[PDB]
Amino acid sequence: TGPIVYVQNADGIFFKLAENDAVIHLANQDQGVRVLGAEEFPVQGEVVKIASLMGFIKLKLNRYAIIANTVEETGRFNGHVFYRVLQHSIVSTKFNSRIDSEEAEYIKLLELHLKNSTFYFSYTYDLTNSLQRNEKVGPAASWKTADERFFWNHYLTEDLRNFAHQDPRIDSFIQPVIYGYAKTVDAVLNATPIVLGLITRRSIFRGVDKDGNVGNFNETEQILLAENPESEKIHVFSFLQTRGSVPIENSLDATKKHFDQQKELYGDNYLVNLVLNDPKIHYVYFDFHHECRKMQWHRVKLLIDHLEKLGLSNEDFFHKVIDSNGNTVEIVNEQHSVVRTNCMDCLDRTNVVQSVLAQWVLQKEFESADVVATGSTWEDNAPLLTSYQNLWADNADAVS
């Protein structure tokens, strides 16, 4: 994948990779997307350089183009760079005085949807899946291999998908984009250079829907990198924690399919709710009882201990070790259990529980790499703690 530039012409718009060469022409005659060579690329005309192309959307008789003007660096991890879409742009082949009044409403609502929305992506990395799932996939494939649930621009690239099934040059054009959060933080604990990071993706689909989807499914991943000159190796962690609705209307078959998918993708599932008898599926309930904030944190700790008593371990995460170049040395551990959080009223509670859980696992991630001592509390370090808190705070700011 790479940057894309284009030329605006009356007959149609001509896209082309910024770096043989494939040209993506959206003609104005039939509003259809077709592939042309570099010779078709206009010698003169306005050359617009953009970050990435989201795809095309067709309403009524007109097909519009969704393009990202510019992006800002939001995260860097093992060379892979995360980008946030600052400015969005919708472009049509027809002039504003030629656009139908009915379609203007649709463009208005769409533009409204694009506002107050944070999109993230990366050229050399597919964030659509977890690092665990990304590791199970070869380094060659990119567009072909992406989570069906978190590939936000799936519909917009349907034509592009169809043209990519035949032409491999189209694969470089299409770029995975996720809705949620994605950022990294540089820090240091016990004289060890460390790079924390967090991702959060919202599902496309959608109680339990008849298809099996539960709706509001937000996969929140917590990744980490640790370089220690004492061990001559680079450690990479990838804790995972999803959330969303919970089956309680809800079909038996739909519940079965849902649970089968959840157990096939995430293995063990701990479902916590806030106010069949499947062995690999546990139901947890929790009430804050309107205590003080400190007492609430304490209650969260107690809930964590309860989950620990249920069989959940703080050692169950994705641990791997790579080489100086980036290639993995060996696979240490895989995560076979997730904790799904479901809440009533304010959604902030979910983010809170996910935060405290993620730190409770984070301590063990630290212990596993000999960064901290056994039984030691990582939370004693103020800068790392406030960096963590800032990260989760901004995550909460993005989710809402």
Binding site: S89, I90, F95, N96, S97, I107
Partner: protein
């Protein structure tokens, strides 16, 4: 302080709706807004490297004019980044591709100007009620396009106390010819007089499309002589208004690109 806006005058000369008349109408909107003293060219040295029509727009006053269209354009200029003249008029005409500013295009301008003229008691719905005004404006236009020495006439709508009267008339001529609606008020004239008038308007276009518009240029036509002297006598008044004049000459530049 004129009664009739430039756009309403142009439209009035129009009848006896192309794209030219619309483009020119928006052009008249920018021109009028500049004449009011609302907008002005940003005092930058770098912008003078490009063409005058590509220069940015800076609004100073926020007071409403009373005219719906002008105030709408003022609103559009109030909440946006400084855009160039040509791009502004293009957006107001809805000729740019971006959908972000799709709401910038003015819809149904004809009805706006119609209600404007009717509520002013000039237009009757059943067809002008007062033909003396139209004939007076036409008299001015012909006084600029035919007369050996330029002399001006004034009505209640366009008094003698009106600021930049000569500029109003010239902008009217340029804007009207931009829409090719000037052909209607040259019908009465003889063939030769028309032939002189059109190229005189061409000279006006070519001379005032740049800033500062040269006045040392002596016309070969012998039509509207001492135009440069009277224009000088206009620039003797209202000093520091060079910005607005840059805007106007910019719009004149736009008219020559239609």
């Amino acid at each position: 302080i004129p009664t009739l806006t430039l756009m309403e005058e142009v439209l009035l000369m129009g009848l006896r709706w192309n794209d030219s008349i619309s483009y020119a109408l928006r052009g008249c909107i920018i021109i009028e807004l500049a004449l009011r003293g609302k907008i002005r060219i940003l005092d930058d040295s770098a912008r003078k490297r490009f063409d005058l029509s590509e220069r940015l727009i800076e609004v100073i006053d926020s007071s409403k004019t009373g005219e719906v269209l002008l105030d709408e354009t003022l609103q559009l200029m109030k909440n946006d980044e400084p855009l160039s003249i040509s791009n502004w008029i293009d957006l107001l005409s809805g000729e740019t591709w971006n959908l972000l500013k799709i709401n910038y295009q003015l819809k149904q301008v004809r009805e706006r100007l119609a209600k404007g003229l009717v509520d002013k008691g000039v237009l009757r719905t059943e067809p002008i009620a007062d033909a003396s005004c139209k004939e007076a404006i036409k008299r001015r236009v012909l006084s600029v396009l035919v007369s050996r020495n330029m002399e001006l006439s004034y009505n209640e709508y366009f008094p003698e106390t009106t600021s930049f009267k000569i500029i109003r008339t010239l902008a009217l001529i340029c804007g009207s010819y931009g829409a090719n609606v000037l052909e209607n008020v040259l019908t009465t004239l003889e063939y030769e007089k028309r032939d002189k008038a059109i190229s005189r308007a061409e000279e006006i276009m070519a001379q005032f499309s740049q800033y500062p518009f040269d006045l040392e240029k002596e016309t070969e036509l012998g039509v509207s002589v001492n135009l440069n002297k009277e224009v000088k006598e206009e620039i003797e008044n209202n000093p520091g208004h060079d910005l607005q004049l840059e805007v106007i000459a910019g719009v004149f530049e736009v008219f020559s690109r239609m």
